[PDB]
Amino acid sequence: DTLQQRLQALIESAGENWTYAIFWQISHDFDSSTGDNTVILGWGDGYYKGEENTAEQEHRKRVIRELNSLISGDEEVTDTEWFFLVSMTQSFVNGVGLPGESFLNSRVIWLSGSGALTGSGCERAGQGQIYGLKTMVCIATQNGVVELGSSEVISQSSDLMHKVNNLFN
Ligand SMILES: [Ca+2]
Ligand SMILES: [Ca+2]
């Protein structure tokens, strides 16, 4: 039932070797100046597997808590472990980047191979590539976006769309 458990069930649910899964969670920001309400994607939770305003305040405190828990806690910090850490404080206006684009258009965005990551023009895909990712997939769901990443080239997953649906819709 927890985001973290669903994320975990998602990637240990066999198939290919995904390095991590993240859930980017919808929140809303009211801009008094414009009278606009903007959807913003922010860290919901994540599971790192490895290789082989009251809402605003709750969100920031939960992330700070999650950063604390992850860091504390003296050995090597790997490229993909770093990317995972670095992702926790990232956020995305709706329409912006791979997560914003997934959500805004109810898309799956599936990027398979280094060339796809840098080629997409998403700064986050680009960032992940720098850190040794070769596949990134973002799947819009009811309350945000599931992102899976792998240092392997993965261009197919039989079950993926079905599991994501059961676990997040
Ligand atoms: Ca967690
Ligand atoms: Ca490096």
From Swiss-Prot:
Disruption phenotype: Minor effect on jasmonic acid response and no effect on glucosinolate biosynthesis. Myc2 and myc3 double mutant has an increased insensitivity to jasmonic acid. Myc2, myc3 and myc4 triple mutant has no jasmonate-related defense response, is devoid of glucosinolates and is extremely susceptible to generalist herbivores.
UniProt region (JAZ-interaction domain), positions on chain: 33-74
Transmembrane domains' residue ranges: none
Organ and tissue specificity: Constitutively expressed in roots, stems, leaves, flowers, and seedlings.
Domain of life: Eukaryota
Factors inducing expression: Barely up-regulated by jasmonic acid.
Function: Transcription factor involved in tryptophan, jasmonic acid (JA) and other stress-responsive gene regulation. With MYC2 and MYC4, controls additively subsets of JA-dependent responses. Can form complexes with all known glucosinolate-related MYBs to regulate glucosinolate biosynthesis. Binds to the G-box (5'-CACGTG-3') of promoters. Activates multiple TIFY/JAZ promoters.
Known partners and oligomeric status: Homo- and heterodimer. Interacts with MYB28, MYB29, MYB34, MYB51, MYB76, MYB122, MYC2, MYC4, AFPH2/NINJA and the JAZ repressors TIFY10A/JAZ1, TIFY10B/JAZ2, TIFY6B/JAZ3, TIFY11A/JAZ5, TIFY11B/JAZ6, TIFY5B/JAZ7, TIFY5A/JAZ8, TIFY7/JAZ9, TIFY9/JAZ10, TIFY3A/JAZ11 and TIFY3B/JAZ12.
Domain-related comment: The JAZ-interaction domain (JID) (82-141) is sufficient for interaction with MYB proteins and most of the TIFY/JAZ proteins.
UniProt-recorded name of the protein: Transcription factor MYC3
Organism of this sequence: Arabidopsis thaliana
Stretch of the intact protein here: 50 to 236 of 592
